[PDB]
Amino acid sequence: IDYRDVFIEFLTTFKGNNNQNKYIERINELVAYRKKSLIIEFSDVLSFNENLAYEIINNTKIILPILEGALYDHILQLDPTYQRDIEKVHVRIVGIPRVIELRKIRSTDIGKLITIDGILVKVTPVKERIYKATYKHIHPDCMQEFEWPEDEEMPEVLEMPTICPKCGKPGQFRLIPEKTKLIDWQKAVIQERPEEVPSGQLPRQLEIILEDDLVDSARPGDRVKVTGILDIKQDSPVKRGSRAVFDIYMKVSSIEVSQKV
Amino acid sequence: IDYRDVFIEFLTTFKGNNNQNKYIERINELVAYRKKSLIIEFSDVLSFNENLAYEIINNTKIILPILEGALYDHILQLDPTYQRDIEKVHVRIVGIPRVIELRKIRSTDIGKLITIDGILVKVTPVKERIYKATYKHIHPDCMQEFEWPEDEEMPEVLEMPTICPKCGKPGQFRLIPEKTKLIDWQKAVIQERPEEVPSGQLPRQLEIILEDDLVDSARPGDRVKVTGILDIKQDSPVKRGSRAVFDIYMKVSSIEVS
Ligand SMILES: [Zn+2]
Ligand SMILES: [Zn+2]
């Protein structure tokens, strides 16, 4: 099953409510204004091809990078000069049928693409962090180079590399010039909407991470629907077998805002 | 995809505006006058092969040393005596379609080959640092010489070789004076052109590093287009309330002086 092909067929052939190619126009804007995210409505995908739609929301980790590669490929065929300005693109899914109430989150929701509908309580100022860099462990027994961070995600905290992935020991790490990339990042807290908070109880809260072009997408007081993979965050618990109570967070993949006046 | 081969094809077959082999002639001048840099116009590369052109500007750190090796190899076949005078050559790309205004630099520009068009404000006097070292493994079973680093130039700071690349064992390594080589370097500051500086505000500035034959390429007051990879410094940032966390600089790969 080649989901790459059906995705491109979807973008180029899907007809909207007015019999217009909704996603051809969204892609042209993206190209014309050098934006790097394409917003896709889940229901549009469902109507076009259900297998694709369910692949997107149930096999997200694996499928999304494949769709993003296909989109980038498609954009470069429309305008080869796009790669001068933008090196990678995001596919951001909105309106998925897995809206979960904060109060009802369960252990099986971890690792899934979910939506939380709540109120943004606070937001940190935008910071740049190292997205990818190469370091050398300056130590007689090692002197090896490694990429850092290992994966492509920063759970709530920003840092420099403290323990070496090659030899497992700390020490001095030299940044290798001209191999560093940066990304914008901020942390925010989303809170239960007042109508969901039972009388006599405090609102539940969730930490979220907004990266790249999702930074400054909303301000305190706004009502927001954030879609992302719910994940656990190792806040140095005594061991691994400590059941995580509040040590969850969401890396946001899409956001819809109802703006507070 | 063998970009080494396409690069040599480009240099030897590209036809200019007057149907002449522009880069054969530039290479001959380089050989005849013992220059060590070949200047390449981005638009020429784009016309010849777009994949190569975009590899050069988007995968610069990896691809450029490969192209420079291929060029050196090609020059030594034309004139083997060139190696008597010049040990290393530079491929310097000009006229790239990524001119960025200093005031508009963003975090995603870090790590990219960019061009800044500005005014040279300050330049330090030229100094010399070690760019290549040869060592001898002082051990009865070995006594062989080797370059270090292996297939790249020495970074700003020396790194002492601990394991021998010839025999795979540690020991005593003697630095060879006569095979250890120096490179000229200087630091400069480029500044926003007056026409870009808004009323009531100071010009933005950027620290740049000029090495080898790029040294003394311009003087204070000159308007310059510098192309290089925008990079961060590793240091104590101590940035109180700043959105930008890291100080930045450019190691210059090409310069045009208008
Ligand atoms: Zn190590
Ligand atoms: Zn040896």
Residues B140 and B253 in one domain: no
Closest chain A residue to B57, measured at CA:
A84
B236 in contact with chain A, both atoms CB, cutoff 8 A:
no
Residues A185 and A228 in one domain: yes
Residues B54 and B157 in one domain: no
Closest CA to A145 of B225, B149, B99: B149
Q: Which residues of B touch A143 (CB under 8 A)?
A: 159, 162
Query: A178 near B61, Cβ under 8 Å?
Result: yes
What is the 3-state secondary structure of A143-186? CCEEEECCCCCCCCCCCCCCECCCCCCECEEEECCCCCEEEEEE
Residues A40 and A169 in one domain: no
Burial code of B167-177, b = ≥16 C-beta within 10 A, e = fewer?
Answer: eeeeeebeeee
Which amino acid is located at B224 in the chain? V
* Structure's resolution in angstroms: 2.0
Burial code of A110-119, b = ≥16 C-beta within 10 A, e = fewer?
Answer: eebbbbbbbb
What does R_g of chain B's alpha carbons equal in angstroms? 21
Distance from the CA of B142 to the center of ligand 2, in angstroms? 5
What does the alpha-carbon distance between residue A89 and residue A34 come to, in Å, rounded to a whole number? 10
Residues A5 and A92 in one domain: yes
Q: How far is CA A149 from CA A129, A161, A163, B206, in A?
A: 10, 8, 11, 27
What does the alpha-carbon distance between residue B232 and residue A177 come to, in Å, rounded to a whole number? 8
Residue A231 belongs to domain spanning? 99-131+180-261
Number of compact structural domains in chain A = 3
Among the bound ligands, the one closest to the CA of A136: 1
User: What does DSSP say about strands B127-138 and B181-191: parallel, antiparallel, or unpaired?
Assistant: antiparallel
Among the bound ligands, the one closest to the CA of A167: 1
**Of chain A residues 73-132, which have a CB less than 8 A from chain B?**
80-81, 83-85, 87, 125-129
Residues A35 and A144 in one domain: no
Q: Is B38 exposed, middle or buried (0-12, 13-18, 19+ CB in 10 A)?
A: buried
CB atoms within 10 A of CB B88: 14
What does the alpha-carbon distance between residue A252 and residue B142 come to, in Å, rounded to a whole number? 58
Q: Name the phi and psi angles at B128, rounded to 5.
A: -115, 140
What does the alpha-carbon distance between residue B77 and residue B73 come to, in Å, rounded to a whole number? 7
CB atoms within 10 A of CB A15: 13
Tokens coding A208: 């979220």
User: What does DSSP say about strands B181-191 and B90-94: parallel, antiparallel, or unpaired?
Assistant: unpaired
CB-CB under 8 Å, B155 with A177: yes
Q: What torsion do the CA atoms of A140, A143, A146, A149 make, to the nearest 10 degrees?
A: 40
Angle value at C-alpha A68, between A65 and A70, nearest 5 degrees = 110
Residues A259 and A166 in one domain: no
What does the alpha-carbon distance between residue B61 and residue B113 come to, in Å, rounded to a whole number? 9
Q: Which of B47, B79, B98 is the last residue of a domain?
A: B98
Q: Is B37 exposed, middle or buried (0-12, 13-18, 19+ CB in 10 A)?
A: middle
**Residue given tokens 């492509």 in the structure block:** A152
Among the bound ligands, the one closest to the CA of A173: 1
User: What does DSSP say about strands A181-191 and A172-175: parallel, antiparallel, or unpaired?
Assistant: unpaired
Q: What is the DSSP string of B13-81?
A: H---TTSS-HHHHHHHHHHHTT--EEEEEHHHHHHH-HHHHHHHHHSHHHHHHHHHHHHHHHHHHH-TT
B250 in contact with chain A, both atoms CB, cutoff 8 A:
no
CB pairs under 8 A between A and B: 58
Q: Which residues of A touch B57 (CB under 8 A)?
A: 84
Q: What torsion do the CA atoms of B181, B226, B82, B66 make, to the nearest 10 degrees?
A: 80
| Structure determined by | X-ray
What does the alpha-carbon distance between residue A232 and residue A244 come to, in Å, rounded to a whole number? 7
Three-class SS of residue B104? helix
Q: Biggest alpha carbon distance in chain B?
A: 71
Residues A117 and A186 in one domain: yes
Residues A145 and A202 in one domain: no
Query: B135 near B146, Cβ under 8 Å?
Result: yes
Three-class SS of residue B194? helix
What does the alpha-carbon distance between residue B153 and residue B193 come to, in Å, rounded to a whole number? 34
Contacts of B252 (CB under 8 A, 6+ apart): B208, B209, B210, B211, B214, B226, B227, B228
What does the alpha-carbon distance between residue B61 and residue A61 come to, in Å, rounded to a whole number? 30
**Residue given tokens 């989150």 in the structure block:** A105
Residues A226 and A139 in one domain: no
What does R_g of chain A's alpha carbons equal in angstroms? 21
Residues lining ion ligand 2 (Cβ < 5 A) are B 137, 142, 164, 166-167
What does the alpha-carbon distance between residue B72 and residue B82 come to, in Å, rounded to a whole number? 9
What is the 3-state secondary structure of chain A? CCHHHHHHHHHHHCCCCCCCCHHHHHHHHHHHCCCCEEEEEHHHHHHHCHHHHHHHHHCHHHHHHHHHHHHHHHHHHHCCCHHHHCCCCEEEEECCCCECCHHHCCHHHCCCEEEEEEEEEEECCCEEEEEEEEEEEECCCCCCEEEECCCCCCCCCCCCCCECCCCCCECEEEECCCCCEEEEEEEEEEECCHHHCCCCCCCCEEEEEEEHHHCCCCCCCCEEEEEEEEEECCCCCCCCCCCCCCCEEEEEEEEEEECCC
Residues B116 and B211 in one domain: yes
CB-CB under 8 Å, A126 with B243: yes
Residues B16 and B117 in one domain: no
